[model samples]
Target: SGEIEFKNVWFSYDKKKPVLKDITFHIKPGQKVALVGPTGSGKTTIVNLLMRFYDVDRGQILVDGIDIRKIKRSSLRSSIGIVLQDTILFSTTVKENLKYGNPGATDEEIKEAAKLTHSDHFIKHLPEGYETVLTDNGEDLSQGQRQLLAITRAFLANPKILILDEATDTKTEKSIQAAMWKLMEGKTSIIIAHRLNTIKNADLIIVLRDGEIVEMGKHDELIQKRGFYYELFTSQYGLVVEKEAAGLNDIFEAQ
Candidate 1:
């Protein structure tokens, strides 16, 4: 039930020059927001501060009215779940990797999480279903399958705050998106994405440039403004919408 708020926040990897300068925003509970920016625009850094991975160089961050710095690190981390661009898994059984999130999870729970992510389909086809041994980095598995397993792992964590950073950046990323949407049924989520298609329906869209808010609004509102958000959306998804519109009109004429 915590809402994330950033006030005049500034950060830098080197401390010599800031990467995020005077950044300010608020994210309410149960709100799904997307962070969009070109590379090196400090998208990941914002996520890092929210997760308390790194402290801001200046300014304050609040979650549920309590400054994040005031909370215990482990406690803060426990309340949040994250999926990064490059997923990581141990060299062990697929079941073991999944159980890392919820060690006490039952076999049925594990299987169900897999099913939600369509991971079960691949797991069942493996030489060993739940018992399949995962090599280092899960190289034996395809990138998409590995992403699903990572998602299943997060479902096991079951945190109230969910952060998805480049969570759908692969050819099989669409399947991961389906799995992620199911997992996000009732959670506050912040998605950092390059491809705009994945977050077309996000409740809030924040476009950042040089660590500042360039534009902020709902999907349709942003489109109406014809600002940076509109340009990005139309450039990426306009063709798909056109194709669908063409098919719909043809169908209506037939009827």
Candidate 2:
């Protein structure tokens, strides 16, 4: 029951110019969707609007078939869990950071969340385990580790909807894919991804360009259409797709 719909949505951050123009889409409950586009393509604006970070200048956003405007901001925020690309960790104890959202979460629950995100091993090796105080917004931790902690914290919330604004890191993303899928069971997930693995597997790919959806379809469908989405996939992956699929690399082997 976490379906999302945006109908003729128009938004502007500065009020002088529009960021998203006539954005419209419907996502079924429990479906995994990916928002993909180049920089300044209004990817985050859509998400921000959904989270009610900013009210739309025109149009409606619905969650579970009800206009989100009608829902209480607190309730709307509580129903959705977001892991931003920029992991925000205050100068607090590891356990406290993890429990920031769900303050009443038990120690066992925190541990389970960490373990499920595959962060337990590193967390255990910390000087004081969960009690280790982060001095500088977790500067001691690697980007991947910080992301895992963020993911763990989000999963711990067990929200009906999940939003993962992933950073550009394929190596760490590879390891966490399994855990992410496991944790997303029965939840609606919206992933803003740069990697093809996530986008190719997404039930729907929303290709936004300059705030407009230029292409909307599955990976295969878009590839077959060889439209904007295909161009985007090819550009992002470069010659790997053509070389690997058609074995064109065999010809270059002669050199």
Candidate 3:
């Protein structure tokens, strides 16, 4: 089990401007926390700092009650699994790619991971099954398929902490949700989500702006406040309604 805490953390790319300002949050073991905001809100920077891609200029980050700075980089990273919006696939057999996370994983373990992400059906239909070779960073597969493979690889890794920069354009949103639950089971998850609907049930949601946290709470609590989070949710709802109406008008025009 892993518990993450950030205490008054501050970060900067250059000495002039700060990217994160006195950020503080705590995620308990098996909690699902969502970070939401517009572009350049410093969401990605938080992940980078948690992963120790960049050291914080001020404050401390603790994992399991120990400061991350005291832990080795390799060991810290090995305990966490991350899936980014952009999937990276090597030119190798499907089975080998899944095994990349855990070199000692058995065949059954690899297949089970794929099954959890609902990727097993597609893999079985491939020309060579698990032995199929991928090229050009999996250009032969659809974007959703590639994302599924990445999720499966993370599952095989079985990390105590999971970081998800949720993928866009999945073939079925339900599958993504199902896979997310499976990955989150018995682990702490931090999700950076653009789609507000997907994270409505999160244990906590941190709203960021200008490199600082503006609001943090459960969905209903934040919505009732009618503050930054409320406005953002309403705006997103309006856009979704407009898109749906446009699609209906198009169908009526063709009739």
Candidate 4:
């Protein structure tokens, strides 16, 4: 029931000019989609709308065919897992913090998820290990480490719809891609990725320009179309697609 649809969605910050103009998209359960766009493409606004902080000006955002605006806040939140943008940690042990995702998750399950995400290494070194109590959004941990913990949290919950945004990390950063293979294992996942192989394999590439969807299709279809998506794909960043991307299959096999 992870299906989601945004139909004729429109949003504006001050109602002066439209931020998202007739934005519409569809995603079925167990399907993964990539949203790519340049800056000021209303990425932030889209996140807010999806997460339900801001209401759409007109049109509907449906999750499992139920309008998100009609769903309860906790119900909407519990069904989705959004990986860390700014991690929110409370006054509790690390283990307990993770349990927020799935109250019934066992210790071994949490550790398993942590290990898969490459976060267990640091957790073992913590002052009190998993029992170490944290302060305000993980004061003792680095931003990247908190994000790693967030990944483990999302992995354990295994929500109906998973989302990863603005991939920011350090150290085992690129491993986020590797970790996703496990977390997104036949699940509905969405990535706000700019220029990466994540787009190459995404089921639907929803490309936005100036807050409007300029292109939407599978990777090859968009490439062949040679539209806005093609330009963005051709203009790769200091992209790391040669060595690791080539051998990622082996890495998965080894695991």
> Which 10 residues in a row give candidate 1 its minimum summed lDDT?
241-250
Kindly report which residue stretches of model 2 are placed more than 4 angstroms away from their true locations once superposed: 169-174, 240-255
Q: Which candidate's lDDT is highest?
A: 3
Candidate 3's residue-wise lDDT over 1-255, tens digit each?
Answer: 689999999999896799999999998889899999988898999989988998999999999988999998898999899888788899999999998779999999889888987888889899999999998879999777887788888889989999888654445556766777788888998999887867888998999998999999999999999999999888878653334343333344453
| lDDT (CA) per prediction | 0.83, 0.85, 0.87, 0.82
Which residue pairs show collisions in model 2? Answer: none
- Give per-residue CA lDDT, model 4, range 136-247, as digits (tens): 6597788777877887888888788887775434456666556667778767888888545666788887888889999998988988998988887787743556453443
Clashing pairs in 1: none
Error of 4 at 29 (Å): 0.7
TM-score of each: 0.85, 0.87, 0.89, 0.80
Best by TM-score: 3
lDDT of 2: 0.85
Report the alpha-carbon TM-score of model 4 versus the true structure. 0.80
Answer with 2 or 4, whichever has the higher lDDT: 2
Candidate 1 backbone clash number? 0
* Model 3: lDDT of residue 247: 33
**Which tens-of-lDDT digit does each residue in 78-195 have in candidate 2?**
9898887678798898899988779999999999888877777778989999999888998998887787788788888878898887557576766567567766888998989776
Q: Which residue runs does candidate 1 get wrong by more than 4 Å?
A: 167-175, 237-255
Better model by lDDT, 3 or 4?
A: 3
